[PDB]
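@channel anyone free to eyeball this complex?
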Amino acid sequence: LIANQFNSAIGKIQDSLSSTPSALGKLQDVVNQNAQALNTLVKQLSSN
Amino acid sequence: VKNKCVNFNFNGLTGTGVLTESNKKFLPFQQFGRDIADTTDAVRDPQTL
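replying in thread with the prediction:
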């Protein structure tokens, strides 16, 4: 039964990653926190 | 000349680089091109438009 529960539990996690898109923001914000500031640097090339 | 690292002076505006043909369709009024950094990247040639 333990094994059954364990197997079932694993499948739910995959579904929980197959469903929710907002969980992984803790990674993606980091990517955004490089994809945001860098771009602004380029815009300071157009300051008189 | 195309695809050559050269010095250009188009209508006063100067610089260096390589020149190629764009597939860009302007409006008949439009002449220049500018970037995010407010830099030139696409120019209409004064002789052969």
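from a first look: The interface with chain A takes residues 36-39 of chain B (CB under 8 Å).
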